[PDB]
């Protein structure tokens, strides 16, 4: 247990910033491609969220070229590289699956602002 | 689904062998009172591990 955790934190990164279930965020991951290897963006919007120490995910909704896509980022993985924060908003919810079936205008979310 | 042959008395007791019983295996005695009681739980009238938990 405490042999673990010390094993966990031993790999936990402190780069990951503030996170709220509703923000836009922009994750950058090493594509690895073929001969090459860069960093691929993924501007999205949070819909579900991790919170399990070394073990954690993002679960983001995009709706890219044509239809929607979802991506649960194992955060603490090198592939994560760097994750932005972009637009933050108001949700009044923990998980936003009620966004699956929505489409523009109806999928619209509010802005946080204190 | 019934029997085909009336079971002998022998085979009966043979089954009741385990269907026996067990005694009290000796019981406890209280410190405060000379209560002859059942281990881990209250004497004839309020006493236990000494004390007097619950009068009367």
């Amino acid at each position: 247990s405490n042999i673990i955790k010390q094993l966990e934190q031993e790999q936990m990164k402190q780069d990951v910033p503030s996170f709220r279930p509703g923000d836009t965020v922009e994750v950058k991951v090493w594509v690895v491609e073929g001969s090459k290897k860069r960093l691929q963006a993924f501007e999205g919007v949070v819909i579900a969220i991790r919170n399990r120490g070394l073990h954690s995910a993002f679960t983001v909704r995009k709706i890219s070229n044509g239809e929607g896509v979802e991506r649960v980022f194992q955060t603490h993985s090198p592939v994560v590289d760097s994750i932005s924060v972009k637009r933050r908003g108001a949700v009044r919810k923990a998980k936003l699956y009620y966004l699956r079936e929505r489409t523009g205008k109806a999928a619209r979310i509010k802005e946080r602002l204190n | 689904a019934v029997q085909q042959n009336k079971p002998t008395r022998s085979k009966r007791g043979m089954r009741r062998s385990h269907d026996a019983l067990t005694a009290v295996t000796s019981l406890s005695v209280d410190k405060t009172s000379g209560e002859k009681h059942l281990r881990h739980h209250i004497t004839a009238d309020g006493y236990y591990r000494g004390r007097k938990v619950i009068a009367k």
Binding site: - | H40, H41, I42, Y48, V53, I54
Partner: protein
């Protein structure tokens, strides 16, 4: 398989184990002592203990939320205004359980859940 599960389901709903308990709960306060099934006792304890721990802090929240559990102000008063500070120092074990078991009807095991400082 029950592996690592908690809370005896007894023999009824999830509505019973939230009434026949909530009741016995106040019945504990209202009388300081009680005779019941060791199993039931070894449960009401998990009920009437987190309530006293809540008795520590007077407050308005700790009153209504203490009313949320048990519908007897008469006891939510004995709590906060008695057993509250009565155990204000108590580390947690606010109750002895005792035993005796064996009832007339059912060969059922009975106990004697009771407040520690029950010396009257």
């Amino acid at each position: 398989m029950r592996h690592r599960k908690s809370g005896r389901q007894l023999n009824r709903n999830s509505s019973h184990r939230q009434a026949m308990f909530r009741n016995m709960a106040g019945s504990l306060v209202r009388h300081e002592i009680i005779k019941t099934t060791l199993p039931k006792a070894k449960e009401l304890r998990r009920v009437v203990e987190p309530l006293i721990t809540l008795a520590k802090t007077d407050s308005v929240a700790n009153r209504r939320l203490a009313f949320a559990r048990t519908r007897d102000n008469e006891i939510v008063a004995k709590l906060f205004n008695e057993l509250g500070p009565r155990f204000a120092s108590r580390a947690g074990g606010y109750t002895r359980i005792l035993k005796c078991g064996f009832r007339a009807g059912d060969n059922a095991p009975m106990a004697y859940i009771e407040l520690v400082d029950r010396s009257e």
